[PDB]
Subunit: 104 residues, 4 copies
């Protein structure tokens, strides 16, 4: 029994990168900036790695541009890769269980 939910509203950092997998499913990557309040309650930007799959990846690939404001709802997944050694990347995964809404 568990719950793994991420909700972000922010601005797309650069144009989305769409790839295709072995069966042809669209996979779209973006970076997303959210602004929090960093002792004078200042400003600070947090950058999020967001990966879409399926129809949302298609929709994100087509309508999201650099600077787009977007609502994103997904689940956290930490991916383990290795370089030359062990590395980790925490991403927000947006698939059938998630949601995306182009705002503006």
């Amino acid at each position: 029994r568990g719950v793994n939910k991420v909700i972000l509203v922010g601005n797309v950092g650069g144009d989305p990168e769409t790839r295709y997998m072995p069966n042809g499913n669209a996979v779209t990557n973006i970076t997303l900036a959210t602004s929090e309040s960093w002792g004078q309650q200042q400003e600070r930007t947090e950058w999020h790695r967001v990966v879409f799959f399926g129809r949302l990846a298609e929709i994100a690939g087509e309508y999201l541009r650099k600077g787009s404001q977007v609502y994103v709802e997904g689940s956290l997944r930490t991916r383990k890769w290795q370089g030359q050694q062990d590395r980790y990347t925490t991403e927000i995964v947006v698939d059938i269980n998630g949601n995306m809404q182009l705002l503006g």
Copy 2:
């Protein structure tokens, strides 16, 4: 705050919590949190409590406790001992967040 940055987790604590205090009065509690889905899949989460909830967290949470956590994502950069850049994404729970012991 111009964006929204919200994380909601329900899961099981991976080990007894580590609390620590500094010369600010602040309590800082660190835990790991397992969320699962069903093959059966498990995701491991690093969660850091600050302030009042840090005090509440250190006391009542124990290895295996079930807990609701609401916080915000924060990625910290650090140079490893090989000089190479690394990143740690944590869930930060403070005054704008929430914690609820379950069971």
Copy 3:
């Protein structure tokens, strides 16, 4: 386009009621209490489950169960026996929602 999300953690008011429609689909109703303290203050929520979650909720929830519910708000209009309009806002948990029995 928009977003309509409700997240509740609370205690089930009574045993669920599960209704089966002529086509075999299930609808399960509960009430769910969430509280805040400062004196108590308990908010009662009407939660309706559809689909696979309706059968799961009907089978595993009982009076007093602690539960996580994720759904969407829906307000229904109806004329009362005095002839006047009334409204009932419910939390609808369907394929887009979630339910986790806690504790």
Copy 4:
């Protein structure tokens, strides 16, 4: 112990209504439409405190807005002397509001 959280993104139905309590505190009411495909759902959202001032100052008919609050079902006496209940989304110090666009 429990959790009561509502997150909405939608469009304001009319210009906001703001009133002032005896202690000077602002209270702002809106209705907010969310849709899904196509059926539209209407929500009664009530802002308190600083967010109520911001809401009253910046929201207008048609504004797209993100809102985060708690559900509160309020009992009130109707125009005839019997009971009406209204479930509202209360947005206060524990909630959030963001103008979108």
